Amino acid sequence: TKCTLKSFTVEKGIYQTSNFRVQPTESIVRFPNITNLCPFDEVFNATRF
Amino acid sequence: CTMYICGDSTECSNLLLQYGSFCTQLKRALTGIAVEQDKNTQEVFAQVK
């Protein structure tokens, strides 16, 4: 409170300072089962385009 | 602002403090309105001891 109000002697009363926010437990990455290597790498092997 | 302007992003919040006190004013201005509504009800009704 004395930080956000920027002093050392805060007066009597209520003061809005910050907010309470919980934090995530873990990380989730979900992708479709398919992981078929992509055939556009064969374009790099090609000579005549 | 920390939740509305930026989606709780540490990268966006750094840019918000770069703008200075454009959000301390709005928090203060809205706080003045909030305490004002509670005062407005006092004169209308709280006229009897």
Q: Which residues from B are below 8 Å from A16, CB to CB? A: 27, 31
Query: Cβ distance A15 to A4 under 8 Å?
Result: yes
Can you say how many angstroms the Cα of residue B48 is from the centroid of all Cα atoms in its chain? 32
Report the distance separating Cα B18 and Cα A10, nearest Å.
Answer: 27
DSSP string, A17-46: --------SS------S--PPPTTHHHHH-
Query: Cβ distance B6 to B12 under 8 Å?
Result: yes
Query: Cβ distance B36 to B28 under 8 Å?
Result: no
Give the method used.
cryo-EM
Give me the total of CB pairs closer than 8 Å, taking one residue from chain A and one from chain B.
6
Structure-token pair, residue A16 = 């809005």
Listed residue (B2, B22, B23) closest to B12, CA to CA: B2
A25-38 residues labelled b (16+ CB within 10 A) or e (exposed)? eeeeeeeeeeeeee
Query: Cβ distance A21 to B8 under 8 Å?
Result: yes
Q: Which residues from B are below 8 Å from A17, CB to CB? A: none
Q: Which helix (H) or strand (E) holds B12?
A: helix B10-17
Report the distance separating Cα B26 and Cα B32, nearest Å.
Answer: 10
